[PDB]
Design an enzyme around this catalytic site. Structure first.
Site, PDB file in Angstrom:
ATOM      1  N   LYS A  60       7.789 -10.295 -15.519  1.00  0.00           N
ATOM      2  CA  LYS A  60       6.293  -9.758 -15.417  1.00  0.00           C
ATOM      3  C   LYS A  60       5.533 -10.598 -16.160  1.00  0.00           C
ATOM      4  O   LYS A  60       4.364 -10.919 -16.014  1.00  0.00           O
ATOM      5  CB  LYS A  60       6.112  -8.429 -15.980  1.00  0.00           C
ATOM      6  CG  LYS A  60       6.936  -7.362 -15.117  1.00  0.00           C
ATOM      7  CD  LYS A  60       6.325  -7.424 -13.591  1.00  0.00           C
ATOM      8  CE  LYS A  60       6.045  -6.059 -13.144  1.00  0.00           C
ATOM      9  NZ  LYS A  60       7.192  -5.756 -12.214  1.00  0.00           N
ATOM     10  N   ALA A  93       0.800  -1.178   0.050  1.00  0.00           N
ATOM     11  CA  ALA A  93      -0.005   0.031  -0.062  1.00  0.00           C
ATOM     12  C   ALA A  93       0.931   1.213   0.045  1.00  0.00           C
ATOM     13  O   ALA A  93       0.354   2.377  -0.170  1.00  0.00           O
ATOM     14  CB  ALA A  93      -1.037  -0.115   1.165  1.00  0.00           C
TER      15      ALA A  93
END
Length: 336
Positions: free
Chosen positions: A171, A9
């Protein structure tokens, strides 16, 4: 109120996700890598919102989120998995394996402790999962057009040839591992998966602590007038649109099981310099002009068509001029 869990976060994208969630009065649990970082988020950055944190130190540990869903598994309905492991000579050991552990691990935690509670999982992937860098330079070849159906064609082995391909491959295989887990467990778990594939992400920071959150922009605003111009080319997208897409992706049924390409257009170093110099006359004594009007991205890059994503999301993306203006004006104001 519904609880949304956002991993990592403190991150650039993640803070905008949490901001826009709190703007809609969601209850939010964010993961942070330390108690200090969590206290800063809860007591300063997101004061005023219903925000709590769990400490998850190592995203590359496949069990890292087990405690989150053992303790909160009855409450978390939405998972926005934006965190990735820290980014070596051993590309396999230091990039590829941590990437697949770092994306599939949280899905395993959900299966183990919250299989019938989590309703939606949105995973932050990358345009790197749509194409290898080796395939990004077929300029104006419409048969080569990269879409949401395109996948990076490098293999686990061939992407280890250099750190750029290796990062991009990490990725690719992170997102593939999410899909392969999902398709093998759709009966074991309730949640529906969606994917966000951002290109190069620009945009202002959610909370300011000439240091932008984009290494491309940082390179440009730190250039000397005489300097060699670095080679940058690809797609751009504003972080605020990236975050907005994450939120719509769990709210709207038509976004279930989509790969949403967060891409607002193409750029090169020269087109960025042209816009920066046009938007910031105050910087004209500092940064180079290059050769204005040259470096047309259409003549450099494989075409990209994310018309499907744009129609599904239904809102127009922030253009590069506004993106760079908001990014760099925030930077200059912070130099007070």
């Amino acid at each position: 109120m519904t609880t949304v869990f956002v991993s990592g976060a403190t991150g650039f994208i993640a803070q905008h996700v949490v901001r826009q969630l709190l703007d809609q009065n969601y209850k939010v649990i964010g993961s942070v890598r330390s108690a200090e970082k969590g206290d800063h988020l809860k007591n300063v950055i997101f004061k005023g919102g219903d925000f709590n944190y769990e400490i998850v130190k190592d995203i590359s540990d496949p069990t890292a989120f087990d405690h989150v869903f053992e303790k909160h598994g009855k409450d978390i309905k939405v998972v926005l998995h934006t965190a990735s492991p820290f980014h070596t000579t051993d590309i396999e050991k230091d990039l590829l394996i941590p990437a697949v552990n770092g994306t599939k691990g949280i899905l395993e935690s959900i299966k183990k402790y919250a299989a019938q509670t989590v309703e939606r999982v949105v995973v932050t992937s990358s345009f790197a999962a749509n194409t290898s860098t080796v395939d990004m330079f077929y300029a104006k070849d419409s048969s080569k057009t990269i879409t949401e159906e395109s996948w990076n064609q490098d293999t686990w082995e061939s992407c280890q040839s250099d750190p750029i391909r290796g990062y991009c491959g990490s990725k690719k295989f992170a997102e593939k591992a999410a899909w392969d887990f999902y398709n093998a467990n759709k009966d074991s778990v309730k949640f529906k998966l969606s994917i966000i594939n951002p290109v190069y992400v620009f945009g202002p920071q959610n909370y300011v602590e000439l240091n932008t959150s984009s290494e491309v922009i940082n390179s440009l605003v730190h250039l000397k007038k005489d300097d060699p111009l670095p080679e940058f080319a690809g797609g751009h997208i504003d972080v605020r649109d990236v975050a907005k897409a994450h939120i719509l992706a769990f709210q709207k049924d038509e976004l279930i099981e989509q790969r949403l390409m967060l891409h607002a257009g193409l750029f090169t170093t020269q087109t960025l310099l042209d816009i920066i110099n046009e938007q910031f006359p105050e910087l004209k004594g500092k940064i180079p002009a290059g050769k204005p009007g040259t470096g047309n991205p259409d003549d450099a890059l494989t075409p990209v068509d994310n018309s499907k994503t744009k129609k599904l999301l239904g809102f127009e993306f922030i253009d590069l001029k506004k993106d760079l203006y908001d990014t760099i004006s925030q930077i200059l104001e912070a130099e007070k």
